[PDB]
Design a protein around this motif. Structure first.
Motif, PDB file in Angstrom:
ATOM      1  N   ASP A  83       1.017  -1.056   0.052  1.00 17.23           N
ATOM      2  CA  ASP A  83      -0.434   0.143   0.486  1.00 17.23           C
ATOM      3  C   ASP A  83       0.566   1.549  -0.041  1.00 17.23           C
ATOM      4  O   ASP A  83       2.350   1.234   0.033  1.00 17.23           O
ATOM      5  CB  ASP A  83      -1.174  -0.272   1.433  1.00 17.23           C
ATOM      6  CG  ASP A  83      -0.316   0.354   2.528  1.00 17.23           C
ATOM      7  OD1 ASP A  83       0.445   0.593   2.724  1.00 17.23           O
ATOM      8  OD2 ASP A  83      -0.897  -0.757   3.618  1.00 17.23           O
ATOM      9  N   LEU A  86       3.812   3.811   4.210  1.00 18.83           N
ATOM     10  CA  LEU A  86       5.321   3.163   4.447  1.00 18.83           C
ATOM     11  C   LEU A  86       6.128   3.350   5.868  1.00 18.83           C
ATOM     12  O   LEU A  86       6.932   2.384   6.688  1.00 18.83           O
ATOM     13  CB  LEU A  86       6.151   4.480   3.914  1.00 18.83           C
ATOM     14  CG  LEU A  86       6.618   3.330   2.311  1.00 18.83           C
ATOM     15  CD1 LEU A  86       6.417   2.915   1.584  1.00 18.83           C
ATOM     16  CD2 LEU A  86       7.471   5.076   1.408  1.00 18.83           C
ATOM     17  N   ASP A  88       4.663   0.871   8.203  1.00 17.75           N
ATOM     18  CA  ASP A  88       4.953  -0.785   8.929  1.00 17.75           C
ATOM     19  C   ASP A  88       5.712  -1.270   7.869  1.00 17.75           C
ATOM     20  O   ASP A  88       6.611  -1.438   8.704  1.00 17.75           O
ATOM     21  CB  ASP A  88       3.806  -1.601   8.936  1.00 17.75           C
ATOM     22  CG  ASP A  88       2.667  -0.913   7.668  1.00 17.75           C
ATOM     23  OD1 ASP A  88       3.231  -0.279   6.232  1.00 17.75           O
ATOM     24  OD2 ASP A  88       1.767  -2.037   7.431  1.00 17.75           O
ATOM     25  N   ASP A  89       5.852  -1.126   6.767  1.00 19.14           N
ATOM     26  CA  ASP A  89       7.611  -1.032   5.531  1.00 19.14           C
ATOM     27  C   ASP A  89       8.737  -0.648   6.579  1.00 19.14           C
ATOM     28  O   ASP A  89       9.754  -1.758   6.638  1.00 19.14           O
ATOM     29  CB  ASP A  89       7.568  -0.652   4.474  1.00 19.14           C
ATOM     30  CG  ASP A  89       6.031  -0.266   3.560  1.00 19.14           C
ATOM     31  OD1 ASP A  89       5.941  -1.691   2.496  1.00 19.14           O
ATOM     32  OD2 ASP A  89       4.836  -0.586   3.868  1.00 19.14           O
TER      33      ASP A  89
END
Ligand SMILES: [Ca+2]
Length: 124
Positions: A83, A86, A88-89
């Motif tokens: 998604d 960013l 959690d990335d």
């Protein structure tokens, strides 16, 4: 494919600044180098599938439908790296840097540990 611009990426990776000693410009370079800023990139690798901007794999870091046997160290569904948010990335990326180092993304750190000024967003 939903690719961001260098300036958007520069603003979005803010929380990674100097993490592990890696400067913000170097993180932007890592992002471009691994996915060309495409937040929805999915690539089939030798023994895993990689997801998103940071190309996090489903063998060790996240869990997906393909490999329910993932160690899932980041404790998250891989689709969460596809998604536009960013956050959690970035949390997972810090865990990767901590555990395996910059070589997860760079064949050689020199690729992005040089000429850093070109990675700074000029309109900021
Ligand atoms: Ca995300």
């Amino acid at each position: 494919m939903e690719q961001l611009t260098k300036c958007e990426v520069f603003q979005k990776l803010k929380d990674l600044k100097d993490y592990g000693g890696v400067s913000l410009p170097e993180w932007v370079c890592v992002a471009f180098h691994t996915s060309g800023y495409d937040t929805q990139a999915i690539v089939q690798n030798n023994d895993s599938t990689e997801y998103g901007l940071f190309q996090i794999n489903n063998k060790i870091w996240c869990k997906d439908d393909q490999n329910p046997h993932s160690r899932n160290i980041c404790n998250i569904s891989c689709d969460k790296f596809l998604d536009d948010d960013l956050t959690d990335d970035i949390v997972c990326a810090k865990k990767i840097l901590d555990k395996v180092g910059i070589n997860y993304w760079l064949a050689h750190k020199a690729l992005c540990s040089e000429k850093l000024d070109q990675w700074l967003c000029e309109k900021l």
